[PDB]
């Protein structure tokens, strides 16, 4: 008696559950398109393991609602991205920066489009996207916060940018905050990443007079079985139904004093 399976193998088994190791990448960096995370595009997982050594190496960005985005993206278990063609007439696309490097060249997030002025005219943008697919879509966009009024004017030809992302159930409006703020990766400007769920039969509406980090499409979202886990335990070649941040564990004994965080069929401590 008193058998609670008090030991772990120290590693995580890649079977039967399809394990995906983020390594130097977090879920959000691979979600956005950080150059170092380009190998993660359109890839599926049953469990996604974030590492403590992960870091960002693109443009400094914040995600205000970081927890729910990270959870619900991992719940669907897929990074499958479907490019959509928005009608961005009158603006300049494919904005690049020096802090975000692809293949020895300046670039930006792979799934985001950084819109600037076209011949110093940045018109009032009104794009409507229908989503007639039988499934909830996930759109990811952002708001650029220039450091000075000079950059605001040189980037968008508009002193007071405004952004309104709307659906038939929600409406999101963001105002950029220009300010003298320190550098991050040698960049004083910053971006705030936001998301919007578009249910089937509901049209996506986006109004933006400036500072719009435009989306390039959507992700397939669903409250599935897959999940995410923070763990530094290496991924090994073995088979185990139960997985914890401390490693994989046999599910034979009824309880488990290893870790309150488990994935799969586990003995419920």
């Amino acid at each position: 008696t008193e058998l609670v399976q008090n030991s772990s193998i120290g590693e995580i088994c890649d079977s039967p559950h399809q394990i995906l190791d983020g390594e130097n990448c977090t879920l959000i960096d691979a979600l956005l398109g950080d150059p170092q995370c380009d190998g993660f595009q359109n890839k599926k997982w049953d469990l996604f393991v974030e590492r403590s050594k992960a870091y960002s190496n693109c443009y400094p960005y914040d995600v205000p609602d970081y927890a729910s985005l990270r959870s619900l993206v991992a719940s669907s278990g897929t990074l499958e991205f479907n490019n959509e063609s928005f009608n961005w007439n009158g603006v300049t696309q494919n904005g690049t920066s020096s802090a975000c490097i692809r293949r020895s060249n300046n670039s930006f997030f792979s799934r985001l489009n950084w819109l600037t002025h076209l011949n110093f005219k940045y018109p009032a943008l009104n794009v409507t996207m229908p989503n007639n697919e039988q499934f909830d879509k996930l759109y990811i966009w952002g708001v650029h916060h220039p450091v000075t009024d000079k950059d605001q004017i040189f980037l968008y030809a508009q002193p007071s940018g405004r952004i309104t992302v709307s659906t038939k159930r929600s409406q999101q409006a963001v105002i950029p905050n220009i300010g003298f703020r320190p550098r991050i990766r040698n960049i004083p400007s910053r971006i705030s990443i936001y998301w919007t769920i578009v249910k089937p039969g509901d049209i996506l509406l986006i109004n933006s007079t400036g500072n719009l980090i435009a989306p390039r499409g959507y992700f397939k979202i669903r409250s599935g079985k897959s999940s995410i886990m923070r763990s530094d335990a290496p991924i090994g070649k073995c088979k185990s139904e139960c997985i914890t941040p401390n490693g994989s564990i046999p599910n034979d004994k009824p309880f488990q004093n290893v870790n309150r965080i488990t994935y799969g069929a586990c003995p419920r401590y």
Partner: antibody, heavy 126, light 108 residues
Framework: VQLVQSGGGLVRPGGSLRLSCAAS????????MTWVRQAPGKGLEWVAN????????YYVDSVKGRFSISRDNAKNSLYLQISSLRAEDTAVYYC????????????????????WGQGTMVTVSG | DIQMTQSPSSLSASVGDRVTITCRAS??????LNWYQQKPGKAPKLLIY???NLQSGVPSRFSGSGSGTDFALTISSLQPEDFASYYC?????????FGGGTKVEIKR
């Protein structure tokens, strides 16, 4: 842009003194604001924090109950009421604009000074 | 609540040497570190933001590193104008304190 101070000088120990710090060149009502001191020839020491709305105030332990930070958002000015002066309060009290924000959706946000004032001497002795 | 310890208190290096300053604290802070520079008799200057990120007017020879509780400010080629007292700020909730200074001298 910079800050300007006034209200420093000699005060007998046990006396009171009021420091003022006027602001210009930014949105004052949307940034944390601080007071930082260093004794002559010594290192720097944090003193006080005040929130953008003036709701949450944080002090170093040696000044609790004696100092009180405050601010006016309609104008652009900080205040550091300083009562019950002790001899170890002799220092050049700087005025910083230490703000804070989340850098990658973090639970707790990273902070640093925004800029520094020049600081006024606040000596205390009979 | 949480206190630091800088090392050394004062040092002496030559022009072109690689000098480093250590900055340790109680709890595990990770990225929540900033570095400062007081030009003598002047106000402090933002040097490094979040352990490693350099700032405006910061020469290329400065570099910060570390995580958790062990942090280092490194000058890759010390220069005459680098004479200053260096401080390292902790981004705890209240900014309790930040380390007692490190005073560098060109000494040549």
């Amino acid at each position: 842009v910079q800050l300007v101070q006034s209200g420093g000088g000699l005060v007998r120990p046990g006396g009171s003194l009021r420091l003022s710090c006027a602001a210009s060149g930014f949105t004052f009502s949307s940034a944390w604001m601080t007071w930082v001191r260093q004794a002559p020839g010594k290192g720097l020491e944090w003193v006080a924090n005040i929130k953008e709305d003036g709701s949450e105030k944080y002090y170093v332990d040696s000044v609790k109950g004696r100092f009180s930070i405050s601010r006016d958002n309609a104008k652009n000015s900080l205040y550091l009421q300083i009562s019950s002066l002790r001899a170890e309060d002799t220092a050049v009290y700087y005025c910083a604009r230490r703000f804070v924000e989340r850098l990658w959706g973090q639970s707790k946000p990273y902070d640093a000074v925004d800029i520094w004032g020049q600081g006024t001497m606040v000596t205390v002795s009979g | 609540d949480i206190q630091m310890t800088q090392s050394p208190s004062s040092l002496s290096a030559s022009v072109g040497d690689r000098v480093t300053i250590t900055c340790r604290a109680s709890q595990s802070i990770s990225n929540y570190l900033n570095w400062y520079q007081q030009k003598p008799g002047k106000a402090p200057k933002l040097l490094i933001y979040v352990a490693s990120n350099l700032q405006s007017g910061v020469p290329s020879r400065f570099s910060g590193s570390g995580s958790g509780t062990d942090f280092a400010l490194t000058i890759s080629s010390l220069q005459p104008e680098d004479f200053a007292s260096y401080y390292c700020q902790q981004s705890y909730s209240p900014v309790t304190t930040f380390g007692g200074g490190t005073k560098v001298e060109i000494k040549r």
